[PDB]
Amino acid sequence: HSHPSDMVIPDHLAELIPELYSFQQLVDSEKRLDHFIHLRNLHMKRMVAQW
Amino acid sequence: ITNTTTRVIPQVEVGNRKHYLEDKLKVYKQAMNETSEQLVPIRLEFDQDRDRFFLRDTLLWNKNDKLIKIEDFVDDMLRDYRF
Amino acid sequence: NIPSLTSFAEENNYQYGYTYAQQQLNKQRQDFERVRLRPEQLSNIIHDESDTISFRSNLLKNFISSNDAFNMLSLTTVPCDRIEKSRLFSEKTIRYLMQKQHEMKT
Amino acid sequence: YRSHIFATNEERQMNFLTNELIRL
Amino acid sequence: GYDINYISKIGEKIDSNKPIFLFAPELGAINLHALSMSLQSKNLGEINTALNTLLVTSADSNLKISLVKYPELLDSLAILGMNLLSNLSQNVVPYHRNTSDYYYEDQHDKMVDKIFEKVNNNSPAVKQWDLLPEPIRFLPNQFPLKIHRTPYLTSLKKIKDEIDDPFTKINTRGAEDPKVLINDQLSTISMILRNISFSDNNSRIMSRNFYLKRFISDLLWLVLIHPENFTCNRKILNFKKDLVIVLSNISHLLEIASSIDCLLILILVISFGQPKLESLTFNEFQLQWGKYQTFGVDILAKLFSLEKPNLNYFKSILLNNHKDKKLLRRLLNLYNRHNLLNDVVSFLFSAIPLQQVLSQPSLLIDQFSPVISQSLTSILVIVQKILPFNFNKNLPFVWLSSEENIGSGLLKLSEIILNINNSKVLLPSINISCVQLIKCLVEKSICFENCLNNDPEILKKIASIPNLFPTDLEIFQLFTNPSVDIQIINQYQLLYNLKNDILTNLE
């Protein structure tokens, strides 16, 4: 049951606990890291196929 | 009759005529620009020669009325005369 | 098919009353826009999370979750001086922050 | 400040250490 | 004191077998004229039993409700939804008023009757009113303070945090509160109107009906600018979830009436999807969640196909009859220059699942070819016919180099689509759309730099995109295979002639 709803700590907890922003922009900092791996993989599928 | 096998019956007519559906915007566009009336005396005479019907009815009619299409009123009148 | 924009006009189509090219175009129009606009009569009728949400199960879970949390409040006869505080860190979060602070000088 | 929870000087420095390691 | 798991287990069966309302097989001969005249009766039972018997039939998918045989039912629905939107923003209670509800119950003699008031003790003016009240704007209560741009997922979390609340009022019933009665009449109106619009004749009859367009432009204001009157937070999501469905089936013939409606359409379509915390301001929507954002990229694909009201209003909104000039200039700077254009283009670059179809090979593109095709058509329309001066920031440059590298994604997608059909109808259009989009983005970046002239070192930064601009070897491959098209290799060779003109002008 992959619920997309409960990946968000929207307002009521982040205002009370300020570390959650430091959590949340952590996760976003991961989400552009793995994508950088993804554009890496499509790079490495390219150049070998180039050669 | 409602006690049936659950069809959809749009507008079961009285006699043989579909209900007159208004415009409700041209009615307000005409009823607010409503200066005068100018009734028109209208005469209808037809014989068994050069025509088949007789139709000797006389009526008034508003000349400034742009709501009712005249062919619809004549088609309602002929249905009222049981043609 | 993929009929026209002229076939969608009100002149070539029927209205509340009270030729051959029109009756040829309205065949393709009703054969195109009834295989396109027809609803799905099968599964994947869930569409999202917030349509198959159940009010009865959530109401039952909230009835349990209020009752036991109120029995946690009143019936627990531990005095306020005797309620021992919980740890703000774990046995693993206290190891990782000893490790990373050791490795922070690189 | 949340000194009601973080009453000890140890846990305030632990929280500051957490923020430091997050930023680093 | 009870074992309420067993009590609820039995009460579920009790609620299932309870006689709440009629089912589909026991409705009998549904008469549309009787429903359409009962909706204008301004009763309470005659309205509700018409609405429920319309909701059961319209969701049945075996009983057709055609408006060719009767086109005045839809006007009754839309005028009822208009008049319920009117007295909801003013908090007036209908259906149980203590007023009398009746009007005036009862020549050469009017001067004689004037002096008859003299010798017994011894000309009325005209009226003016309209059929429908104000749309909901131009009311003294309704002035915009905050455009409620809540996203999809935060709305789902707000719903799940309102349902799972101990002191919840989501089931306070109908007869215990009149405001929830108005809201549950409006939700029935919206479910009916989204159920009717799945027919070939209803989709072109609903297209005009000035009443339906005014009701859509009336609700879309209330659900976005002042949603404080709707009781629950699930009804506000469900109005957006069927307004987009009813606008997905209509919009191929819709002519947008006013510019405020053309802005609220954009904000409603934008409100599906997830933003970030310039660059592309929309994280990619992965379609393991819900296909509701794919309906918006068809509304924007079909409403851009008319050069008159549809594209003139969109142009004047994206780039920039006497009170809405003040309303549009209030709504545009309440939306936090050119944030709207880059938000729409970044959202349209979302719902093209580049990461998902390029992670794992033919099934996902065969499933998502229409949404990809219409999204590329919408982006091509925005690039070619809107972007060509009051800009102050290079938008195609910050789309081409926004650290996600969507141009390389489109080029790899064109490679993938070119390597299935030659080794399933829309793919020759999608290839040419991808290549022409990359070409127009590069050319408009260079043209925007020539117009602005503030960043001179961009010819390096355009040519330093790691997987743009396909090499001469794959174009040598494309000029040999007979299974390729002519326009595909034409767009590819045009793109390579752009690549050579980059390097010549580089030094």
Question: How would you sum up this structure, described in words?
Answer:
This is part of a larger assembly, with chains A (51 residues), B (83 residues), C (106 residues), D (24 residues) and E (507 residues). With 51 residues, chain A is mainly α. Chain A has one helix at 19-50. Chain A contains one helix and no strands. In chain C, 4% of the residues are buried. Chain C has 106 residues and is mainly α. Chain D has 24 residues and is mainly α. Chain D starts with 8 loop residues before the first helix and ends with a helix. Chain E has a two-stranded antiparallel ribbon. By secondary structure, chain E is mainly alpha-helical. Chains in contact: A-D, A-E, B-C, B-E, C-D, C-E. Chain E: A zinc finger (C4-type) spans 434-451. Chain E: It comes from Saccharomyces cerevisiae (strain ATCC 204508 / S288c) (Baker's yeast). Chain E: This is SWI/SNF chromatin-remodeling complex subunit SWI1. Chain E: Belongs to the SWI1 family.
| Beta content of chain A | under 5%
**Strand content range of chain B:** 5-15%
User: So how many helices of chain A?
Assistant: 1
Please state the structural category of chain B. Answer: alpha+beta
Helix-strand topology string of chain A: H
* Residues in helix, % of chain B: 10-25%
Overall geometry of chain A comes to elongated
* Class derived from helix and strand content of chain A: mainly alpha
Instruction: Determine Rg of chain A (CA atoms, Å).
Output: 17 Å
Net shape of chain B? flat
Order of helices and strands of chain B: EHEEH
For the largest interface in this structure, which chains are involved and how many residues does each contribute? C-E, 30 and 39 residues
Give the oligomeric state of the chains in this entry, treating copies of one chain as homo and distinct chains as hetero. part of a larger assembly
Query: In angstroms, what separates the terminal alpha carbons of chain B?
Result: 28 Å
Q: Helix fraction of chain A?
A: 55-70%
Q: How would a crystallographer describe the biggest sheet of chain A?
A: none
Measured distance between first and last alpha carbons of chain A: 43 Å
Question: Rounded to an integer, what's the Rg of chain B over CA atoms?
Answer: 18 Å
Number of helices, where a helix is a run of at least 4 consecutive DSSP H or I residues of chain B:
2
Number of strands of chain B: 3
